[PDB]
CSV table of C-alpha atoms in Angstrom, one decimal:
chain,number,residue,atom,x,y,z
S,3,UNK,CA,-48.9,15.9,-10.0
S,4,UNK,CA,-47.0,19.1,-10.5
S,5,UNK,CA,-43.7,19.1,-12.4
S,6,UNK,CA,-40.6,20.4,-10.6
S,7,UNK,CA,-36.9,20.7,-11.5
S,8,UNK,CA,-35.6,18.9,-8.4
S,9,UNK,CA,-36.5,17.0,-5.3
S,10,UNK,CA,-34.9,15.2,-2.4
S,11,UNK,CA,-34.4,11.4,-2.5
S,12,UNK,CA,-34.9,9.0,0.3
S,13,UNK,CA,-31.2,9.1,1.2
S,14,UNK,CA,-31.4,13.0,1.5
S,15,UNK,CA,-29.6,14.0,-1.7
S,16,UNK,CA,-30.9,16.4,-4.3
S,17,UNK,CA,-31.8,15.0,-7.7
S,18,UNK,CA,-32.5,17.4,-10.5
S,19,UNK,CA,-33.5,17.2,-14.2
S,20,UNK,CA,-30.4,16.1,-16.1
S,21,UNK,CA,-28.9,14.2,-13.2
S,22,UNK,CA,-27.7,10.6,-13.4
S,23,UNK,CA,-29.4,8.1,-11.2
S,24,UNK,CA,-29.8,4.4,-10.6
S,25,UNK,CA,-33.3,3.2,-11.3
S,26,UNK,CA,-35.2,0.1,-10.5
S,27,UNK,CA,-37.9,-1.8,-12.5
S,28,UNK,CA,-39.1,-5.4,-12.2
S,29,UNK,CA,-37.0,-8.0,-13.9
S,30,UNK,CA,-33.8,-5.9,-14.2
S,31,UNK,CA,-30.9,-5.0,-11.9
S,32,UNK,CA,-30.6,-1.4,-10.8
S,33,UNK,CA,-29.7,0.4,-13.9
S,34,UNK,CA,-28.3,3.9,-14.8
S,35,UNK,CA,-30.6,6.6,-16.1
S,36,UNK,CA,-30.9,10.2,-16.9
S,37,UNK,CA,-33.7,12.3,-15.2
S,38,UNK,CA,-36.0,14.0,-17.7
S,39,UNK,CA,-38.7,15.3,-15.5
S,40,UNK,CA,-39.9,15.1,-11.9
S,41,UNK,CA,-43.5,15.2,-10.8
S,42,UNK,CA,-44.9,15.7,-7.2
S,43,UNK,CA,-48.4,14.7,-6.1
S,44,UNK,CA,-50.7,17.6,-5.0
S,45,UNK,CA,-53.5,17.7,-2.5
S,46,UNK,CA,-56.5,17.3,-4.9
S,47,UNK,CA,-54.9,14.2,-6.5
S,48,UNK,CA,-55.9,10.5,-5.8
S,49,UNK,CA,-52.6,10.0,-4.2
S,50,UNK,CA,-51.1,13.4,-3.1
S,51,UNK,CA,-48.0,11.7,-1.6
S,52,UNK,CA,-46.8,10.0,-4.8
S,53,UNK,CA,-43.7,11.4,-6.4
S,54,UNK,CA,-42.1,10.2,-9.6
S,55,UNK,CA,-39.4,10.9,-12.3
S,56,UNK,CA,-39.4,10.3,-16.0
S,57,UNK,CA,-36.0,8.8,-16.8
S,58,UNK,CA,-34.1,7.8,-19.9
S,59,UNK,CA,-32.1,4.6,-19.4
S,60,UNK,CA,-28.5,4.5,-20.5
S,61,UNK,CA,-27.5,1.8,-23.0
S,62,UNK,CA,-31.2,1.5,-23.8
S,63,UNK,CA,-33.9,2.9,-26.1
S,64,UNK,CA,-36.5,3.1,-23.3
S,65,UNK,CA,-38.0,5.9,-21.1
S,66,UNK,CA,-39.8,5.1,-17.9
S,67,UNK,CA,-41.6,6.6,-15.0
S,68,UNK,CA,-40.1,5.7,-11.6
S,69,UNK,CA,-41.4,6.5,-8.1
S,70,UNK,CA,-38.7,8.6,-6.4
S,71,UNK,CA,-38.4,5.6,-4.1
S,72,UNK,CA,-37.2,3.5,-7.1
S,73,UNK,CA,-34.3,5.8,-7.9
S,74,UNK,CA,-31.0,6.8,-6.1
S,75,UNK,CA,-28.1,9.1,-6.9
S,76,UNK,CA,-25.6,7.4,-9.2
S,77,UNK,CA,-22.2,8.2,-7.5
S,78,UNK,CA,-23.2,7.7,-3.9
S,79,UNK,CA,-24.8,4.3,-4.7
S,80,UNK,CA,-22.3,3.1,-7.3
S,81,UNK,CA,-20.3,0.7,-5.3
S,82,UNK,CA,-23.5,-0.7,-3.8
S,83,UNK,CA,-25.4,-1.1,-7.1
S,84,UNK,CA,-22.8,-1.7,-9.8
S,85,UNK,CA,-22.9,-5.4,-10.7
S,86,UNK,CA,-19.3,-6.5,-11.4
S,87,UNK,CA,-20.3,-9.7,-13.3
S,88,UNK,CA,-22.9,-8.5,-15.8
S,89,UNK,CA,-21.9,-8.1,-19.5
S,90,UNK,CA,-23.3,-6.7,-22.6
S,91,UNK,CA,-25.8,-3.8,-22.7
S,92,UNK,CA,-25.6,-3.5,-18.9
S,93,UNK,CA,-21.8,-2.8,-18.9
S,94,UNK,CA,-22.2,-0.5,-21.9
S,95,UNK,CA,-24.8,1.6,-19.9
S,96,UNK,CA,-22.4,1.7,-16.9
S,97,UNK,CA,-19.6,3.0,-19.1
S,98,UNK,CA,-21.9,5.7,-20.7
S,99,UNK,CA,-23.2,6.8,-17.2
S,100,UNK,CA,-19.8,6.9,-15.6
S,101,UNK,CA,-18.5,9.0,-18.5
S,102,UNK,CA,-21.5,11.3,-18.4
S,103,UNK,CA,-20.9,11.8,-14.6
S,104,UNK,CA,-17.1,12.2,-14.8
S,105,UNK,CA,-17.0,16.0,-14.2
S,106,UNK,CA,-19.1,16.0,-10.9
S,107,UNK,CA,-18.2,12.5,-9.9
S,108,UNK,CA,-14.7,11.7,-11.3
S,109,UNK,CA,-14.4,9.0,-8.6
S,110,UNK,CA,-16.8,6.7,-10.5
S,111,UNK,CA,-14.9,6.7,-13.8
S,112,UNK,CA,-11.8,6.3,-11.6
S,113,UNK,CA,-13.1,3.2,-10.0
S,114,UNK,CA,-14.3,1.7,-13.3
S,115,UNK,CA,-10.8,2.3,-14.8
S,116,UNK,CA,-9.2,0.5,-11.9
S,117,UNK,CA,-11.7,-2.4,-12.1
S,118,UNK,CA,-11.4,-3.0,-15.8
S,119,UNK,CA,-9.1,-5.9,-17.0
């Protein structure tokens, strides 16, 4: 594919390099990540319609490649995707991501602060 600086997700929102997203891989819940690159399939490719992003997971050492279909914008999907029960690394990642997002999506850190006990 060809790298680009942004694309539109399946829910119709723009995702750009540097943005915070929920990402999905097998064996883990939806997990917050930072977008490092975005790649779009091109007509000479084996699969011209494939599109993906390279992401860095919060609360984690790992970087992964996700189909755009396996990510979503962080704020808009937060209430849906945030697991209120999970502990440890997962909750630390949530905290980091909410803090990172607090200037464009202050509602998330707001919700997390209300939720904490």
